[PDB]
Amino acid sequence: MASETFEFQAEITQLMSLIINTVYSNKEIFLRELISNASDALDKIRYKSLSDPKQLETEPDLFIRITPKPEQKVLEIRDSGIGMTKAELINNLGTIGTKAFMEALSAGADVSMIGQFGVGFYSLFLVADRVQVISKSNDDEQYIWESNAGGSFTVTLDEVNERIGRGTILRLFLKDDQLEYLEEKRIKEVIKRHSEFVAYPIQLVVTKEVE
Amino acid sequence: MASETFEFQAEITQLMSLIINTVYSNKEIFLRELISNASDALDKIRYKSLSDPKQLETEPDLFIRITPKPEQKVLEIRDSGIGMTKAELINNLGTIGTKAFMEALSAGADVSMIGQFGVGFYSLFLVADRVQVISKSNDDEQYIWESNAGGSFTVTLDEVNERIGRGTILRLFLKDDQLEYLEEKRIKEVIKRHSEFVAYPIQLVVTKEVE
Ligand SMILES: CCO[C@@H](O)[C@H]1CCC/C=C/CCNC(=O)c2c(O)cc(O)c(Cl)c2CC1=O
Ligand SMILES: CCO[C@@H](O)[C@H]1CCC/C=C/CCNC(=O)c2c(O)cc(O)c(Cl)c2CC1=O
């Protein structure tokens, strides 16, 4: 199953590089941004479903789910939102707001503003050096978009991950110094602090050895 | 990705049908049998690794993991044991002990003996009307064996489920009256009662909405 490679729009590559290298202290803001995106996508499939009810049948439950995978130093944020087609992943995430945030930043702006420029997605590079966005739109097959903050990303038809009925998974490969975001306590503390007013259930998946 | 269909050896079909239909009370024994199988497979990759250390690299952690999936009425039991090749799944599970258990049964035997006849796998039909066995041996690709207790099963190259590095997942589609096995409390109670002496960590995956 062959990967396709695409070039990032120049300013996006610009944004990603300063973030992956930054010494900024409050890296935990990435989670609010990703939950905010998840909530948005859930709004869209819900609003969409107002006039097209069958759009919900691929995954009737509306949720945001966070799943620590300690062994792989991975953190996943899933939602059963509207999802993105292959062409949406390519367009939305790489090939097409941005520059103005970098300008605000260089003047003293707090990266927490990132979401107000519409580019909070990229805040994930505060805690991760690599990401896979796995997405299933009702309108397309399941696809994997992958980036390590370089100048190019890949998109691959998904034959390796669990089927999500509909929606998007952000699979973050955490940096070695950022492994705290795998911890149930840390995660819950960050959720409560910055994501108080979310319309959808936020589920936390915890793995505990029984005794 | 095309399915292949195989016929069950007659006595196996025999065994499965009486179990899926039985009014037997103590259906919870299925879990000890599946944990026992998981432990066995883990023994085999560990013993195997004694003379062939690199066999462990596909999945360095040795664990048994149970994952309730309430939305799908599914219960998964995973291990990172030795796993089964496509030919092993076909051979082991369908096409090749058994009859003597059915004879013990018809004389008054308790189905809890099933494991002593080497066929405890089939006890899963006490709680499930359908199963998918997903397996990855170091020696083959990932495959899905599926049965609903009929006279035939299917085997399909796996392009739809998460990659397991190595091992086996039993995905049980629980009957409507058996949904109690999705419950953290129930599961823990059954583990402690019948699986006290297990050499490997038994991990329980619990999904909890945060507030
Ligand atoms: C600037 C890049 O574009 C994005 O940020 C957008 C894409 C366009 C805007 C909204 C589209 C609807 C579907 N959204 C998603 O699938 C999505 C999600 O369900 C969680 C996320 O964490 C991100 Cl990232 C995205 C994708 C996402 O939020
Ligand atoms: C009678 C049918 O044969 C089986 O029962 C056997 C297959 C032959 C014996 C042992 C083989 C080593 C690998 N075992 C597995 O992958 C396995 C597992 O890791 C969990 C299970 O729950 C079952 Cl079921 C099996 C498969 C299993 O235990």
Domain ranges of chain B: 1-211
C-alpha–C-alpha distance, residues B101 and B19, integer Å? 12
- DSSP 3-state assignment of A141? coil
Enumerate chain B positions whose Cβ falls within 8 A of a Cβ in A: 61, 65, 71, 159-163, 188, 191-192, 201-210
User: What is the SS3 assignment for chain B?
Assistant: CCCEEEECCHHHHHHHHHHHHCCCCCCCHHHHHHHHHHHHHHHHHHHHHCCCHHHHCCCCCCCEEEEEEHHHCEEEEEECCCCCCHHHHHHHHHHCCHHHHHHHHCCCCCHHHHHHHCCHHHHHHHCEEEEEEEEECCCCCCEEEEECCCCEEEEEECCCCCCCCCEEEEEEEECHHHHHHHCHHHHHHHHHHHCCCCCCCEEEEEEEECC
**Interface with chain A: mutation pick from B64, B80, B134, B207, highest number of A CBs within 10 Å:** B207
Taking the CA of residue A47 and the nearest CA in chain B, the distance in Å comes to 23
A6: helix, coil or strand? strand
Interatomic CA distance for residues A81 and A28, integer angstroms: 23
For residue A39, the ligand closest to its alpha carbon is 1
Q: Would the annotation count B118 as a binding residue? A: yes
Q: Which atom of ligand 2 is nearest to the CA of B119?
A: 1
Antiparallel, parallel or unpaired: β B202-209 and B64-69 = parallel
Which class would CATH give A1-211?
alpha beta
Cα separation, B81 vs B144, whole angstroms: 16
A100 CA distance to ligand 2 centroid (A)? 58
Resolution value in angstroms: 2.2
Compute the half-sphere exposure of residue A79: CA atoms within 13 Å on the CB side of its CA: 26
Rounded CA-CA distance A50/A43 in Å is: 11
Instruction: Decide: helix, strand or coil at residue A72.
Output: helix
User: Distance between CA atoms of B100 and B95, rounded to whole angstroms?
Assistant: 17
